């Protein structure tokens, strides 16, 4: 069974700020995901992969950044694309998608 749900919406980069990565997810020849939480509540899930997806060239970069923000617990800005909707979790109170960028930036800065 496939796990790719295309909403078909345009190339919009949706950004969620002041969020921390927890609850890692992984699978064989598939993606790696995470639940991002703010103020003790879950906001959005994001995923990366080398095998499938139109963001296949992303992984070899994103993962490295990802690792850092999980081992130091840095609150970052997560940039997500809604062209692909994922359900890799169970009994989820959120939505899981394809990760597209990370931005560790000071508040109110043009480099976010």
């Amino acid at each position: 069974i496939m796990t790719t749900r295309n909403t078909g919406q345009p190339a919009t980069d949706h950004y969620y700020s002041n969020v921390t990565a927890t609850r890692l997810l992984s699978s064989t020849n598939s993606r790696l995901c995470a639940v991002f939480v703010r103020s003790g509540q879950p906001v959005i899930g994001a995923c990366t992969s080398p095998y499938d997806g139109k963001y296949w060239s992303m992984y070899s970069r994103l993962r490295k950044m990802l690792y850092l923000i999980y081992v130091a617990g840095i609150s970052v800005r997560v940039h997500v694309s809604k062209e692909e909707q994922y359900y890799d979790y169970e009994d989820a109170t959120f939505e899981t998608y394809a990760l597209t960028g990370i931005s560790i930036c000071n508040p109110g800065s043009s480099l976010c």
Partner: T-cell receptor, first 116, second 110 residues
Framework: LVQAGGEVKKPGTSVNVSCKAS????????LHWVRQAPGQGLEWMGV??????????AQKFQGRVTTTRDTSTSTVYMELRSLRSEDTAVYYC????????????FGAGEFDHWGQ | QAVVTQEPSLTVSPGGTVTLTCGSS?????????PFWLQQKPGQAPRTLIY???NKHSWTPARFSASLLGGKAALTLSGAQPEDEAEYYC??????????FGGGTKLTVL
């Protein structure tokens, strides 16, 4: 979250309405000022932003409605002037979006919290 | 000065599907207009139902859906249970963070 009591005025006067919430909600969220006339549909007045310091209004209320914010009381104050006959109504403050996010969000979203 | 037209009232017998539509006088409603649908119970503050024409909140029952239909922002309710009598509103977005509501619809089932 919580609202003030009722108030009856005369034509030509001004009204001040209070809307209080928690410190976190008061600090990091947009608010929408909305009114509702009896037996009528809703009408959307304006949107107020913490960081910007300015309130965006429809052209109808440009220059006659004022919004102020109190961090000591953590309460938003709405002031209305130049009253007319039909403006008798109930008034609401509504919780909007987070500071740095876009719209799409499952647990929380636009218009998720209204006062009484 | 954009105005939004919306249905005054509708009613279909239990178990049916009811379609509501809202439209703008400025032209055909697209995905950039950001349709919103709000829900109000009697004697209670209104509750948001749907945003961005495709997104369902956690409190939204799975019997509601939203889309575009004939260049009109449309909602469809299937399996009309006899408890969802309510008062509905459409919301369209315009440049400058300008939101315009409709007239509202007293959706009462018989």
């Amino acid at each position: 979250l919580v609202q003030a009591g009722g108030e009856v005025k005369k034509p030509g006067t001004s009204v001040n309405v209070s809307c209080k919430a928690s410190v976190y909600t008061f600090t990091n969220y947009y608010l929408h000022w909305v009114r509702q006339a009896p037996g009528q549909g809703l009408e959307w007045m304006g949107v107020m932003n913490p960081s910007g310091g300015k309130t965006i209004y429809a052209q109808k209320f440009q220059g006659r409605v004022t919004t102020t914010r109190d961090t000591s009381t953590s309460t938003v104050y709405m002031e209305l002037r130049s009253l007319r006959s039909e403006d008798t109504a109930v008034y609401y403050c509504a919780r909007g979006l987070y500071y740095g996010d876009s719209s799409g969000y499952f647990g929380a979203g636009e218009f998720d919290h209204w006062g009484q | 000065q954009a105005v939004v037209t919306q249905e005054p009232s509708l009613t279909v017998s239990p178990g049916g599907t009811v379609t509501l539509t809202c439209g703008s006088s400025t032209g055909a409603v697209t995905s950039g207009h950001y349709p919103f649908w709000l829900q109000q119970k009697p004697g209670q503050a209104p509750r948001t139902l749907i945003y961005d024409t495709s997104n369902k909140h956690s409190w939204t029952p799975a019997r509601f859906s939203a889309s575009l239909l004939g260049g009109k922002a449309a909602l469809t309710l299937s399996g009309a249970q006899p408890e969802d009598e309510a008062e509905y509103y459409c919301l369209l977005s315009y440049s400058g963070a300008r939101r315009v509501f409709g007239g509202g619809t007293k959706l009462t089932v018989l």
